[PDB]
Amino acid sequence: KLLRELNQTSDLNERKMLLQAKSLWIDVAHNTDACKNLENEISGIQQK
Amino acid sequence: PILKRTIISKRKAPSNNEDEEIVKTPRKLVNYVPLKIFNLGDSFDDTITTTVAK
Amino acid sequence: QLLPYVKVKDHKEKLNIYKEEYERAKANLRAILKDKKPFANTKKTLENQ
Amino acid sequence: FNEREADLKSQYEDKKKFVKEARDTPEFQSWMREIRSYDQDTKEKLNKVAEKYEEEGNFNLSFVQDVLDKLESEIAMVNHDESAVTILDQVTAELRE
Amino acid sequence: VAALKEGIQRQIQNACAFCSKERIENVDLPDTQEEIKRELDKVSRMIQ
16 A cells, blocks of 8 residues: 555656656757757858 | 835835946857756756656 | 735846946947047048048 | 947847836736735735735845745645545534534 | 767766656657746655
């Protein structure tokens, strides 16, 4: 019964795990888009 | 009444939050410094909850 | 029920910083506009030279 | 100097646009209506609770983080609420009987 | 860019360690970091 309560809590825990993984993925996406912007800026500087 | 005037901020109370230096301070021509390893979030650790998910 | 304190404080701070930035920008613009005419006068003197 | 002043003028116009955007906001439209809502019940208990809130705010030495922390704490407290609250009088009446 | 790429490699290795980066993009969540931080605080309080 405590394990069933753990399952009920773990549904929210995995939801929090997914939210934190989504936050990490968005951080990775922010880093990647900023890297793409830096690549565009370096490409413009290389064109100059 | 008194509560509204105390809560509200007079525009004259500060010097319009004036900045330091007459003009903006100069910067390096590139000065990228990407950093941004963490954007908000943080707080509860991911490793412990990942082991909990496993 | 009253004005939101966080929002009013944030709005006042942003208005103050925007107003000071506007004031410094307009002061700099007036200074450069006043200083521009002597450059035109110097260009006229250099064309005379 | 002409290109530099043109850039400064463009920045000045951008700053003026930012200043204009700072005012006449939807939040400002919300304002002057909250003032009417406060004027609906003037002072009395509301003045006392407002004075207590001001004292708490100045004691906390914060205006943004403190309010968010209190809001999060009160939402967390309200999350566990209304447990078996459907019947309060009947159970007491039957217990007394 | 190399330092940013090393940071991105560390972040993606952490994302692979924590669930999977490729398994998170399918889920829908607002891009704004402040909303995600508020949701993380809310779920943390719910877990507490």
